[PDB]
Amino acid sequence: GDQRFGDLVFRQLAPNVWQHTSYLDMPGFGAVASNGLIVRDGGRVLVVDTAWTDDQTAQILNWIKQEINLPVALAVVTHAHQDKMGGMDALHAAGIATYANALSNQLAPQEGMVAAQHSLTFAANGWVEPATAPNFGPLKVFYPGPGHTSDNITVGIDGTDIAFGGCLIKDSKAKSLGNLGDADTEHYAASARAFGAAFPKASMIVMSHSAPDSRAAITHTARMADKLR
C-alpha cells in the first residue's frame, strides 16, 4: 500500500493519516530513511517533521496538493536535527506556520537548523501548554523528557491507534539504541516509558528510522535504555 512520488514514499496508516518517508544516500553507508506524518483534519492538513532537505520537503507539499488538495495549516517538528528540521525553509516559503519545542528553537542555530516560527512549552507532566499549540486539532503533543536529545517531543493522533515517537523510539527488533554520543543515557528509559504512559491507546508506534511497530518498540527501547544506568 506504499505510493512513490519522486524520491519520497507515502503509506496511508489511517483514513486521514499518512507516513512520509525521505532518504539521504551516504556514500558507502547507503540510503537512510526518515519518517514523519501527514494528518487530514477536516479542511486542513497538519504535518509532523520535514524531510531531510528543502527539495524533499517541497515534494511532500506537492504530493499533499495532488493527493489531498487541502492547505497545510501548520507543521510541528520533533527536534533540532536534519532529518526532522532540514526542510523548514520549504515550509516557510509555502507560508506554513511552524511549531517546535522552545528548546528545539533555542538549539536550532547551534545544530545548523532553521528555527520554527512558534515555540511550544510544556507543563511539569510533559503535556504541551494548549495556548502555545492553538488549533492543533487531533495532534496531542507530549514532551516525554530527555532521551535521543534534551528537546525530543512526541505526537499522538487523537481518534486513531497512532502515536509518533520520532527518533526517541527504536523498533522492537533493534540490536541497540544506536549512537549514544549526544544522548541523555540517564533519563532515556523513563522518557521512553513516559511516551508509552502518555498514549496508552496507541497500538501503532510510528518512529523516524523504522517501519510502524507495536508497543513492543516502547518496552524494548526502555529495556535497552535501562542497561545504560
Binding site: 551516504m26 526518515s34 536535527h81 532529518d83 545544530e111
Partner: peptide
C-alpha cells in the same frame, strides 16, 4: 554531519 542516526 549530524545526519540523524549517522553522527557525521
Amino acid at each position: 554531519x549530524x545526519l540523524x542516526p549517522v553522527p557525521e
